């Protein structure tokens, strides 16, 4: 195996395929990247046994076929550390892989390509293409609502669903839920899968924010995404995930509309004097007015009064202010609509100008 490639043609791919690797690999091979030269292409692959990221790099300089695995962090750091424009010559020499550039030389230890973990073959059952920007929107709109190491391991991931002509994501941790739907232009078979936490992170990382379209393939137990010369594949999480349609408040009769930023800034200031652990704030809704109050164990108190559009009966309701701020931060809009029922029921929050995303937050008893 032999290849010579310009530093920058190699750097981003190395960075990307290293994504799924941890700071401390359980076993040596998991800290390595698989390098394969075949048919004028160098392929780089990184894995954590649950998912893998592959990059294809075109070789325009002389090369020889073959494969090996070498330490990912070390190889990336070497390439990144070389001068801009450096030519990086690489050759497999049995127990070691020799990297040369200028008068810089590096000998890395190798592990057999035959020993590199490989995800089982699988078949795609649904396929579609969508703009990278749509995938980014879908994930960013709901990722914060995923559980963090919950017993219901399925809540630690994100649900991806195809319906009619839309792709939708759903995340929930039992206290709040986020759902976002986006049209795809294609007619798809109704489908529902759970993508693991690290999988969601990798999907986001592979979006360059360019014109390259995103091609998705979903099987019974895997999801694959292709962008440019990168291919990400992850196993899916098994389990039964909640039906957002049922979690949404049944009859949120009371509707309030308010500027997103004024509401966010008021909650942010009130949060300063809320209980450091429980973070509770009180909302008192009255005709065209919202009063937010917060108090803590030190007898400190914050009060914010805001003009809003509201005509229902008066009511008071408590919330974890961090859950509310998380939603307002995810909604990048001018105005928001809060739909309430009563003090003991969940509230649904959405962009006042779009039903694309919806957030359900359960209240707390102050």
């Amino acid at each position: 195996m032999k290849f010579t490639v310009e530093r920058e043609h190699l750097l981003k791919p190395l960075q990307q395929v290293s994504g799924p690797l941890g700071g401390r690999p359980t076993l040596p091979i998991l800290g390595n990247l698989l390098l394969q030269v075949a048919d004028g292409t160098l392929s780089l692959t990184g894995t954590d046994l649950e998912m893998e990221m592959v990059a294809r790099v075109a070789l325009v300089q002389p090369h020889e076929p073959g494969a090996t695995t070498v330490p990912a962090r070390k190889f990336f750091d070497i390439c990144r550390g070389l001068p801009e424009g450096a030519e990086i010559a690489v050759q497999l020499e049995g127990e070691r892989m020799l990297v040369r550039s200028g008068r810089s030389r590096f000998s890395l230890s190798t592990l057999p390509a035959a020993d590199f973990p490989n995800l089982d073959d699988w078949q795609s059952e649904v396929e579609f293409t969508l703009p990278q920007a749509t995938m980014k929107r879908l994930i960013e709109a709901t990722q914060f609502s995923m559980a963090h190491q919950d017993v219901r391991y399925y809540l630690n991931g994100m649900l991806f669903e195809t319906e009619g002509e839309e792709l939708r994501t759903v995340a929930t941790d039992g206290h709040r839920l986020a759902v976002c739907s986006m049209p795809i232009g294609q007619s798809l078979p109704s489908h529902s899968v759970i993508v693991p936490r690290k999988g969601v992170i990798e999907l986001m990382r592979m979006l360059d924010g360019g014109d390259n379209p995103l091609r998705v393939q979903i099987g019974s137990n895997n999801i694959r995404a292709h962008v440019g010369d990168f291919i990400f594949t992850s196993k899916l999480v098994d389990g039964r995930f909640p039906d957002y349609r049922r979690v949404l408040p049944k009859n949120p009769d009371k509707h309030l509309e308010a500027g997103c930023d004024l509401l966010k800034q008021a909650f942010a200031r009130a949060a300063i004097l809320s209980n450091e652990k429980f973070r509770g704030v009180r909302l008192y809704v009255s005709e065209n007015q919202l009063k937010i109050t917060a108090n803590n164990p030190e007898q400190e108190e914050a009060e914010e009064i805001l003009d809003v559009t509201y005509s229902g009966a008066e009511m008071e309701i408590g919330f974890n202010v961090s859950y509310v701020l998380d939603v307002l931060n995810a909604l990048k809009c001018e105005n928001v609509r809060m739909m309430l029922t009563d003090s003991v029921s969940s509230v649904q929050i959405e962009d006042a100008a779009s039903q694309s995303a919806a957030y359900v937050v359960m209240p707390m008893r102050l």
Binding site: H175, N320, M362
Partner: peptide, 7 residues
Amino acid sequence: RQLVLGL
């Protein structure tokens, strides 16, 4: 004092 959703 946090209540939970009916998932």
